[PDB]
UniProtKB/Swiss-Prot annotation:
It comes from Laticauda semifasciata. Disulfide bonds join 3-20, 13-41, 26-30, 45-56, 57-62. Belongs to the three-finger toxin family. Long-chain subfamily. Type II alpha-neurotoxin sub-subfamily. Coiled coil: none annotated. It is found in: Secreted. The chain holds residues 22 to 87 of 87 of the full protein. One of its GO terms (molecular function) is ion channel regulator activity. Expressed by the venom gland. Keywords: Acetylcholine receptor inhibiting toxin, Disulfide bond, Ion channel impairing toxin, Neurotoxin, Postsynaptic neurotoxin, Secreted, Signal, Toxin. It comes from the Eukaryota. One of its GO terms (cellular component) is extracellular region. Binds with high affinity to muscular (tested on Torpedo marmorata, Kd=1.6 nM) and neuronal (chimeric alpha-7/CHRNA7, Kd=3 nM) nicotinic acetylcholine receptor (nAChR) and inhibits acetylcholine from binding to the receptor, thereby impairing neuromuscular and neuronal transmission. Also shows a very weak inhibition on GABA(A) receptors. This is Alpha-elapitoxin-Ls2a.
Length: 66
C-alpha cells in the first residue's frame, strides 16, 4: 500500500492496485479551517474531475514535486 497514513486521511493501496492518488480540495469557507484532503489507492495518476485537485503520488510524495 502507498500513503498509508500521511498527515491526511490516507487510504493505502495494498491490493492488486499499487498506485496512490492524492485528492485535495477546499470549501467556500475553509479559510484555514478543516481542509478535507486525503490520499488513497489508484491505478494511474488521474486528473482534476470536478473542482478537486488530484495529483500523482506513490509514497511520501503526495505533497511534493508540484
Amino acid at each position: 500500500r502507498e500513503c498509508y497514513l500521511n498527515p491526511h486521511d490516507t487510504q493505502t493501496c495494498p491490493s492488486g492496485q499499487e498506485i496512490c492518488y492524492v485528492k485535495s480540495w477546499c470549501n467556500a469557507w475553509c479559510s484555514s479551517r478543516g481542509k478535507v484532503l486525503e490520499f488513497g489507492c489508484a491505478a494511474t495518476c488521474p486528473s482534476v474531475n470536478t473542482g478537486t485537485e488530484i495529483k500523482c503520488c506513490s509514497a511520501d510524495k503526495c505533497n511534493t514535486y508540484p
